[PDB]
Design an enzyme around this catalytic site. Sequence first.
Site, PDB file in Angstrom:
ATOM      1  N   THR A   1     -15.205  -8.614  -1.078  1.00 36.61           N
ATOM      2  CA  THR A   1     -15.419  -9.684  -2.028  1.00 36.61           C
ATOM      3  C   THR A   1     -15.817  -9.134  -3.403  1.00 36.61           C
ATOM      4  O   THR A   1     -16.296  -8.010  -3.522  1.00 36.61           O
ATOM      5  CB  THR A   1     -16.478 -10.698  -1.484  1.00 36.61           C
TER       6      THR A   1
ATOM      7  N   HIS B   1      -7.748  -5.644  -8.390  1.00 30.12           N
ATOM      8  CA  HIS B   1      -8.898  -5.585  -7.492  1.00 30.12           C
ATOM      9  C   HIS B   1      -9.864  -4.600  -8.111  1.00 30.12           C
ATOM     10  O   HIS B   1      -9.450  -3.780  -8.946  1.00 30.12           O
ATOM     11  CB  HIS B   1      -8.447  -5.112  -6.113  1.00 30.12           C
TER      12      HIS B   1
ATOM     13  N   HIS C   1       0.806  -1.210   0.000  1.00 25.83           N
ATOM     14  CA  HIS C   1       0.000   0.000   0.000  1.00 25.83           C
ATOM     15  C   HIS C   1       0.847   1.272   0.000  1.00 25.83           C
ATOM     16  O   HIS C   1       0.358   2.359   0.327  1.00 25.83           O
ATOM     17  CB  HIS C   1      -0.903   0.016   1.230  1.00 25.83           C
TER      18      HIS C   1
HETATM   19 NI    NI Z   1      -4.278  -0.686  -6.149  1.00 25.33          NI
END
Ligand code: NI
Length: 498
Positions: free
Chosen positions: A258, A287, A61
């Site tokens: 999810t 994601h 991150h």
């Molecule tokens: Ni990312």
Amino acid sequence: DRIDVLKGEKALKASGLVPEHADAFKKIARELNTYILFRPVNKLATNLIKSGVATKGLNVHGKSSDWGPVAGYIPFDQDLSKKHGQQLAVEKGNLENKKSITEHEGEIGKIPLKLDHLRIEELKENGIILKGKKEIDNGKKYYLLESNNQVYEFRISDENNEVQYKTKEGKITVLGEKFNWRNIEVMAKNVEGVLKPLTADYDLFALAPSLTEIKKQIPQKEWDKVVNTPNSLEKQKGVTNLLIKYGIERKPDSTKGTLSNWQKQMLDRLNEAVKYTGYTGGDVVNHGTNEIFIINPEGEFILTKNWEMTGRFIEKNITGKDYLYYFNRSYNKIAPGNKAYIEWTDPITKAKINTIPTSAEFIKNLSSIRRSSNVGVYKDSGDKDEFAKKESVKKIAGYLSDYYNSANHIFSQEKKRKISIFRGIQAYNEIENVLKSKQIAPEYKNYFQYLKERITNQVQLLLTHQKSNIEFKLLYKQLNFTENETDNFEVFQKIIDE
Ligand code: NI
């Protein structure tokens, strides 16, 4: 909606995505009839990504850098990222990078930054750094690297492209530190026993599939049996159950993060399309969930300039044309003319808002008030009616979200606007009832008056947007000119006085 948006090549340049990747996405959107939205990519990461550097995934991150020699990569030391000198920020980043290494038992590490041949060139093509006059230290051969850094100085090496760094003569880092020459280390991934450097990844903002296209794929018998029935106009729970059944919409109680089964296949399709174009660093999209890059069902590129503009673009072209999208963040459906919209200040965050909150924002706002004032929405202790009281706040939160989303599962475009306005009106009604119990603390009372005003304002501008003379008509239809002037004037006077 189309408030000064960018499109075509200009939209592509502002988005950061590598040209060949965006082009392969264009086909997906067109083959699947879906809108694809991306957050903008760090423009100094584009070359890295096209040259095969791997992207950061879920486990890292740390912010990439926009400046210096490290630009494009993720510096272990976050004071070398887009965060020039934000104490709080840099400290959060450094911690995250340390934990990334400890928590993944070897899959994530850090390695010395090596600015190869072509890279230094590319940095020189842009306004980032230039090579220069050599330097001697400890029998070492160097070359300083010029960068507008206020606080740091860099330099490279000859045999190994290692890049080093130190603090200015009397300058201090934002943490209250200073030091002599240390190599610059960047975040990395363990590929096959070897740590490879990481760069920015493509952040999916959303994937909005065609609702009509979806309906066409479901067995006709089942659809007509789950949709066409008793629910009169609004309240389509049936549509929602089918979308969940066929893996289009995520499970009932969305786990931490999810993804629906349709969303997972969409990720595989995107990443696969990028590999097919020569990309060798693995996956570019990892994601699925303030400018926004959009690729429509026709392969066109659009770029919205700020959130309000993208909120309006989604309502008009995506949600308003039957594509699927759920709003978690609020925006004003109709923009500000001369008279600015009133604002509310969060007691805690000190942030200002001028929109009708969505459900989650409403819950947070109430949370700030609870903290700041140290009491709950109602006052009667030894809760009695504790059931309706809780239900009451829940109903308001539900209608606030309905205002923005009930039209998501509604097919008729003219019905979409109509249901949205009505939802806003239901919210108003519920809020007013809470205030009519007279058992509301005072800090909440102010916030509820703010909601009533914004709702009133937006619902008035929406009705008028449809029928510009509706205010006149709502009153006019109630008048009777068959009566005599005096009687008819009393009626008029009652209506506008009440
Ligand atoms: Ni990312």
